[PDB]
Design an enzyme around this catalytic site. Structure first.
Site, PDB file in Angstrom:
ATOM      1  N   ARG C  23      -5.667-127.561  14.305  1.00  0.00           N
ATOM      2  CA  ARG C  23      -6.242-127.503  15.646  1.00  0.00           C
ATOM      3  C   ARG C  23      -5.117-127.160  16.618  1.00  0.00           C
ATOM      4  O   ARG C  23      -4.398-128.054  17.076  1.00  0.00           O
ATOM      5  CB  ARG C  23      -6.916-128.819  16.014  1.00  0.00           C
ATOM      6  N   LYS C  44     -11.760-119.205  12.521  1.00  0.00           N
ATOM      7  CA  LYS C  44     -11.005-119.581  13.710  1.00  0.00           C
ATOM      8  C   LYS C  44     -11.883-119.403  14.939  1.00  0.00           C
ATOM      9  O   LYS C  44     -12.484-118.340  15.128  1.00  0.00           O
ATOM     10  CB  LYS C  44      -9.734-118.738  13.838  1.00  0.00           C
ATOM     11  N   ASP C 142       2.552-112.970  18.235  1.00  0.00           N
ATOM     12  CA  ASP C 142       3.403-114.144  18.073  1.00  0.00           C
ATOM     13  C   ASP C 142       3.696-114.334  16.594  1.00  0.00           C
ATOM     14  O   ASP C 142       2.770-114.453  15.785  1.00  0.00           O
ATOM     15  CB  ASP C 142       2.737-115.396  18.655  1.00  0.00           C
TER      16      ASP C 142
END
Ligand SMILES: Nc1ncnc2c1ncn2[C@@H]1O[C@H](COP(=O)(O)OP(=O)(O)OP(O)(O)=S)[C@@H](O)[C@H]1O
Ligand SMILES: [Mg+2]
Lengths: 53, 584, 261, 53
Positions: C23, C44, C142
């Site tokens: 989470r 997701k 990222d």
């Protein structure tokens, strides 16, 4: 030089020369050769080949 | 021979094949094991050179020495200038004219345009490299500076990959008995201080903390192998103790085996394999024969069941001195688990084991626990993370935990143990005599139901110190259940990791009470939980008191505001011994 | 009850959440099972309504429509991307056992740290994936250990692209996100794998302190007597304030390959 | 060669035709493209002079 140094293990077949007809004429109706010159590195088999012949 | 390539190729010269076959015949008929026999690539060339330079009638011993040195410098400067094919001008520049009747110089003449030119050449590039090495070893327009160190660093980078062989043949020549034989053959004394210079280079390379620029560990192993001098190898290998090597050929296997056998100061070893049991047999046999070893890293190696069986057979040796062996992602299974249990029950030196990512299975764990429950089982720490295990083997795990007198820390996370498995483990860990100290259920899918059982284990067993439960969504009810037990004075936990625990802001008061009361825990990690700015503020308010015996707090992945960040920094600087890690 | 009709491949009823893998602040990932197909994937979900300005979410969906076509052995497989339950729903491949975030924590338990050989073996694949996607002008937003996944076979799968874990020098003094930002993130990931920790850890957890730390590019060099000189310098080159100072993706991939060899 | 005229004419001298045909044989058997090969009119004369003296 370089490859044989590395491994020279690749499949590279060639057409071989025989020994009984080393003096026969190139064609089939020409003149037979009257001199052959074996040449190779030092200690590669010249004298042993002469003895074998 | 076929294992070695530099020899298989140059074995076309019939004389150089006879020189290598008689060499093996001597060992074969002199009561020796060829399986352990060595055939260094430099002895063949030394014997070839000696056989070729037969005195053709007593004449010009000094002349022969001078012409050999001239040819030798020719090879050296040719190797430095990448001069594969020399010319008459260069042969004249170097002290040479005739005499040398193409022993290692075959005049291959190339015709271009209208006429053909000489273009002298060496019988082979490896031969020319050997002659360059002989130039360096032997003792005295200018050819490359005889700095052995200069040649050495040139072999050490500067895109001179064409110097590994020259260095190898220098090492082969610096051999004591071989050097003496060459001296007796050529009537010219040699210099041995080059050997000490090379030894100091190896010392620098070893005191370089795996610098592995080029002259890496495997390259130095090959160099020493070709050196074949036992005392020199012993005196040089002592700087290796931390060794990381990987194998791709039988020659690599042999070099690593010989180097390890000669090594006397080896503790940490990591071994990798590419593309097994036949060579690994001897490799691990030599490892077991070694008596100074402490570690064995076989991780990221596809050993397989036959490989694991060979390894356990080797470890079963009474002289085995291996203390730690990491087998992560080695493709092991239950079948090899049988032999692993045999090793655990037989060997009394094993201390720890990590078998992460092993397809052990319920049957594998069943076989493993058989060895664990043996009285001779002296294993302490076990890692079985992501072993695909389930609660079915939890019965055997609890039995071994309650039985063994040495097994202390067990980490079996990443397994479908479940609440039932956790309760099964707890029913045995609750025993106060149980030796379990650090328990890890990393992402074990634990719920709040097992929280009460774990609290009972904490209150009953007095040997538990650290608890990791990452990846389990305990919830606030589970947090309170755990706190109810950890607040008990009998609780002796020191570090508690509960990241990815699915903890809400409700557990904030639970954790505040734990911080205010708990007198044993030292570290609390709770990241990846939205406790909230209110929770962080209350925790800091409780922490600013001098009664907080804990020292480490981890709130990583928690996102707060500027006010909360400033308060956290103020608390951390007000209590330097109490650290809070909340970096962005 | 009445589950949503299982007609297409974009619907929650077609997925059974075995558990919650994690989470994060931006997304919640669950181990779903495609009922229509019958394979365990990763679902997701992100609350688009919260950070939904209507100028970013539409483009995000349009671009993520390209991602399933991204077929690389070292990149997570993108199965589905739809909207349901007032939030996004992304179906991807699931790699639970392989998660560098958990691997680093597990290894930190033992005093001995990861080996140069293994880090190189993983880094070559990471570079291959980065170069493959960059050559198509697509970038990893990222790159982090928590979003880099591996498998039992030893393959490294790049996770779904998202304060971030790694603050780019171009992010600081914000001007954009260049191809060299990915290089910086990859170098920081190498440092994290090497030291079990990111190159910007410290007691001073304040934003200004860490930002100036990034600007000055001062970090505790990796252990020389356990990690290699060329690797310790490659990480330094990849971690540089200057954008062009960072070596290109092809350059880093080539060096990684020559070291894995 | 036929493209070049100063050579086609002086190619009557058999030696100066051999000197130009062996020159092309070298390129042909040395892994090169004759379509881009060059045969300057002065190299032939240099080789001719050298062979004669
Ligand atoms: N046909 C062959 N089969 C196997 N071994 C051979 C053969 N010919 C030669 N040898 C080996 O090679 C050695 C020498 O071979 P030779 O060709 O006689 O060397 P060599 O060329 O006479 O030496 P040089 O060059 O004349 S100084 C012999 O002692 C044999 O052991
Ligand atoms: Mg002879």
């Amino acid at each position: 030089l370089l490859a044989i140094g590395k491994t020279k293990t690749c499949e590279s077949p060639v057409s071989p020369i025989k020994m009984e007809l080393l003096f026969d004429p190139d064609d089939e109706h020409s003149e037979p050769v009257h001199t052959v010159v074996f040449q190779g590195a030092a200690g590669i088999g010249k004298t042993i080949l002469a003895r074998k012949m | 021979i076929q294992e070695n390539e530099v020899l298989f190729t140059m074995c076309f010269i019939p004389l150089v094949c006879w020189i290598v076959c008689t060499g093996l015949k001597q060992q074969m008929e002199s009561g020796k094991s060829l399986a352990q026999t060595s055939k260094t690539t430099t002895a063949v060339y030394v014997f070839f050179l000696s056989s070729l330079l037969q005195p053709r009638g007593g004449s010009q011993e000094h002349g022969l020495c001078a012409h050999l040195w001239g040819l030798c410098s020719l090879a050296a400067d040719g190797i430095w200038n990448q001069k594969i094919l020399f010319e008459e001008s260069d042969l004249r520049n170097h002290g040479l004219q005739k005499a040398d009747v193409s022993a290692f110089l075959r005049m291959n003449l190339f015709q271009k345009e209208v006429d053909c030119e000489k273009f002298y050449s060496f019988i082979h590039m490896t031969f020319q490299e050997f002659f360059a090495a002989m130039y360096y070893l032997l003792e005295e327009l200018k050819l490359p500076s005889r700095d052995v160190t200069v040649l050495l660093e040139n072999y050490g980078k500067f895109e001179k990959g064409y110097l590994i062989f020259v260095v190898r043949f220098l090492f082969g020549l610096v051999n004591q008995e071989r050097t003496s034989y060459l001296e007796k053959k050529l009537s010219c004394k040699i210099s041995q201080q080059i050997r000490l210079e090379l030894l100091k280079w190896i010392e620098v390379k070893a005191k370089a903390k795996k610098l592995q620029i080029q002259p890496s560990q495997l390259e130095l192993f090959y160099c020493l192998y070709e050196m074949q001098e036992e005392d020199f190898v012993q005196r040089a290998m002592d700087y290796f103790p931390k060794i990381e090597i990987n194998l791709s050929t039988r020659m690599d296997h042999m070099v690593s085996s010989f180097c390890i056998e000669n090594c006397h100061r080896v503790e940490s070893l990591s071994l990798g394999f590419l593309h097994t049991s036949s060579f690994c047999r001897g490799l691990f046999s030599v490892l077991s024969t070694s008596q100074s070893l402490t570690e064995l890293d076989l991780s990221d190696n596809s050993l397989g069941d036959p490989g694991m069986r060979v390894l356990c057979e080797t470890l079963q040796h009474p002289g085995c001195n291996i203390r730690r062996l990491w087998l992560g992602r080695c493709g092991l299974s239950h079948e090899c688990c049988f032999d692993i249990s045999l090793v655990l029950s037989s060997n009394q030196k094993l201390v720890e084991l990590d078998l992460s990512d092993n397809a052990l299975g319920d049957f594998g764990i069943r076989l493993l626990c058989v060895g664990l429950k043996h009285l001779l089982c002296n294993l302490k720490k076990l890692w079985l993370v992501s072993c695909c295990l389930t609660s079915a083997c939890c019965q055997d795990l609890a039995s071994v935990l309650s039985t063994s007198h040495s097994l202390t820390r067990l980490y079996v996370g990443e397994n479908a143990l479940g609440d039932s498995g956790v309760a099964i483990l707890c029913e045995k860990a609750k025993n106060p005599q149980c030796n379990l100290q650090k328990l890890g259920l990393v992402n074990s899918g634990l719920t709040s139901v097992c929280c009460s059982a774990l609290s009972s284990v904490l209150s009953t067993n007095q040997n538990l110190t650290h608890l990791y439960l990452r990846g389990n969504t305990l919830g606030d009810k589970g947090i309170k259940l755990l706190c109810e037990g950890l607040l008990h004075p009998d609780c002796k936990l020191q570090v508690l990791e509960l990241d990815n625990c699915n903890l809400t802001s409700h557990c904030c008061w639970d954790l505040s009470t734990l911080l205010t009361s708990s007198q044993s825990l030292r570290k609390l990690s709770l990241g990846n939980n939205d406790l909230g700015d209110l929770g962080v503020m209350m925790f800091c308010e409780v922490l600013k008191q001098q009664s907080c015996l804990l020292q480490n707090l981890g709130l990583s992945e928690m996102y707060f505001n500027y006010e909360t960040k400033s308060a956290l920094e103020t608390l951390q600087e007000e209590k330097p011994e109490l650290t809070v890690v909340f970096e962005p | 009850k009445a589950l949503r009709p299982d007609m297409g491949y974009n619907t929650l009823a077609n997925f059974r959440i075995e558990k919650k893998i994690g989470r994060g602040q931006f997304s919640e990932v669950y181990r779903a099972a495609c009922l229509l197909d019958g394979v365990p994937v990763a679902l997701k979900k992100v609350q688009i309504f919260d950070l939904m300005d209507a100028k970013a979410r539409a483009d995000c969906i349009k671009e993520i429509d390209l991602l399933k076509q991204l077929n690389h052995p070292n990149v997570i497989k993108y199965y589905a991307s739809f909207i349901e339950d007032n939030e996004l729903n992304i179906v991807l491949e699931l790699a639970d056992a392989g998660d560098l975030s958990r691997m680093i924590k597990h290894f930190k338990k033992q005093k001995r740290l990861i080996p140069e050989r293994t880090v190189w073996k993983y880094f070559v694949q990471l570079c291959s994936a980065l170069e493959h996607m960059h050559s198509r002008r697509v970038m990893h937003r990222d790159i982090k250990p928590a979003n880099v996944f591996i498998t039992a076979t030893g393959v490294v799968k790049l996770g779904d692209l998202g304060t971030p874990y790694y603050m780019s020098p171009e992010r600081i003094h914000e001007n954009g996100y260049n191809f060299k930002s990915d290089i910086w993130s990859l170098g920081c990931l190498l440092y994290e794998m090497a030291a079990l920790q990111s190159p910007f850890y410290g007691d001073k957890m304040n934003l200004y302190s860490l930002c100036k730390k990034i600007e000055q590019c001062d970090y505790p060099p990796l252990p020389s007597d356990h990690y290699s000189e060329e690797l310790r310098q490659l990480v330094n080159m990849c971690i540089n304030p200057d954008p062009e100072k960072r070596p290109d993706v092809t350059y880093v991939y080539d060096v990684a390959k020559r070291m894995h060899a």
